Design a protein around this ligand. Structure first.
Ligand code: HEC
Ligand code: HEC
Lengths: 108, 294
């Protein structure tokens, strides 16, 4: 997948409706069902201090960037077989681009 | 002369490829109309629909059950125990219109099978052949279980569906799916966080969360945890009863085991009351969309 800048506002709505259930994005924000995502880009998978990751997530050892994040969100279980994140994926490129444009900003 | 028998009769020329086409239609719509219930999607309500339409069965006189597809009639449609199921019914309407030849009971049950499989649950062998019966065959309300009860109530209730301890505990694991809605049942909240993925989370949460019995906004009591999950009084009775607890524990520690038992119990549930000719086809095991490179 190759990221292309989109709409942060629409991404914020996608996050609220599809992600907030399990993740927070603010710096120092709390872990919930899923790991807090602040600082996610530029960090390796399964490294959020204080969160109990699945064995599969940590072993993926992916250094998250806008592109592999797009690949991941297209089909999570496919990219990280065995992850415990329950989410079928955002199948539309436009959707993934708006979301990551927002995530890049909200986490930053 | 004497008691009701319901013989499985699959429409002429209709075979496995036909039913797989219906399965695909449901699975596709499940993906397309994904906003429902804050994006949980229609999978859980479809599973609850298959269960409520089959759960009216009384093994003592063979009334109710999935055979006749009577939920389409007023009386059952408006059973308060079915509040919210109208959503699953509406979801399936267009599907039935595209495939007019499928029976109502066959469609309601296939809907539950498809939803379980598409939510990554176990494969549920399924058999076609349910036949629509007249309005007069619609059971009265009152046959579905009350959630504010205890283990003894759960055990004796399920005896009417010919279900044993193992089958009861396994079937209850479907509560991993969806959530309770205060406007529908007087209870509010999800049993877990993976609302639209079929796992053994129900048993894990039952055993690992710290539960506190509390009143909700409808004045009913439910067991709530700090994580924001809930358990109905009947769900929690599974760890109050010793026999049930041992089975809860084994599913909590072995999902493959839960999957296999749930598969057997759910098909049995779906086929209760049905007499299948001995020359009838082997149950069908539909391929998921993923399994079709789709
Ligand atoms: C639960 C129902 C969740 C929803 C909805 C989403 N996520 Fe998730 N996410 C969740 C869990 C429990 C986990 C852990 C996975 C594991 O196997 O341990 C995650 C993980 C991620 C990750 C990786 C984080 C890291 O490696 O540090 C990302 C980047 C992530 N989730 C993103 C994310 C987004 C953008 C979501 C919606 C579109 C989303 N998650 C939904 C649980 C849940
Ligand atoms: C194999 C299926 C299955 C069994 C058996 C089952 N349920 Fe559930 N039940 C569901 C599903 C799935 C939902 C979630 C529905 C949704 O999210 O719309 C549900 C939802 C409910 C709800 C909430 C409905 C609402 O929308 O408010 C109640 C209350 C309930 N079940 C009670 C029971 C009781 C009592 C028993 C038996 C002791 C039982 N269930 C057995 C599948 C089942």
């Amino acid at each position: 997948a190759e990221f292309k800048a989109g709409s942060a506002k629409k991404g914020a709505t996608l996050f609220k409706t599809r992600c907030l259930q399990c993740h927070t994005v603010e710096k120092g924000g709390p872990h919930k069902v899923g790991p807090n995502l602040h600082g996610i880009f530029g960090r390796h998978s399964g490294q959020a201090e204080g969160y109990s990751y699945t064995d599969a997530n940590i072993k993926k050892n992916v250094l998250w960037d806008e592109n592999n994040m797009s690949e991941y969100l297209t089909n999570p279980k496919k990219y990280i077989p065995g992850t415990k994140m329950c989410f079928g994926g955002l199948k539309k490129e436009k959707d993934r681009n708006d979301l990551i444009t927002y995530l890049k900003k909200a986490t930053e | 002369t004497t008691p009701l028998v319901h013989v499985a009769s699959v429409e002429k020329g209709r075979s496995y490829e036909d039913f797989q086409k219906v399965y695909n239609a449901i699975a596709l719509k499940l993906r397309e109309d994904d906003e429902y219930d804050n994006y949980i999607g229609y999978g859980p309500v479809l599973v609850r629909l298959a269960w409520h339409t089959s759960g009216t069965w009384d093994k003592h006189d063979n009334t109710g059950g999935s055979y006749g597809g009577t939920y389409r009639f007023k009386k059952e449609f408006n059973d308060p125990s079915n509040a919210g199921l109208q959503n699953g019914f509406k979801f399936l309407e267009p599907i039935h219109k595209e495939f007019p030849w499928i029976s109502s009971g066959d469609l309601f049950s296939l809907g539950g099978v498809t939803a379980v499989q598409e939510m990554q649950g176990p494969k549920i062998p399924w058999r076609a052949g349910r036949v629509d019966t007249p309005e007069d065959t619609t059971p009265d309300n009152g046959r579905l279980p009350d959630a504010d009860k205890d283990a003894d109530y759960v055990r004796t209730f399920f005896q009417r569906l010919n279900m044993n301890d193992r089958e009861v505990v396994a079937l209850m694991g479907a509560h991993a799916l969806g959530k309770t809605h205060l406007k529908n049942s007087g209870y509010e909240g999800p049993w877990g966080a993976a609302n639209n993925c079929f796992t053994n989370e129900f048993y894990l949460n039952l055993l690992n969360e710290d539960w506190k019995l509390e009143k909700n906004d409808a004045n009913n009591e439910q067991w709530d945890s700090k994580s924001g999950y809930m358990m109905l009084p009947t769900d929690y009775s599974l760890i109050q009863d010793p026999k049930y607890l041992s089975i809860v524990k084994e599913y909590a520690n072995d999902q493959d085991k839960f999957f296999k038992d749930f598969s057997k119990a759910f098909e049995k549930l779906l086929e209760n009351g049905i007499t299948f000719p001995k020359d009838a086809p082997s149950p069908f095991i539909f391929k998921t969309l993923e399994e079709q490179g789709l």
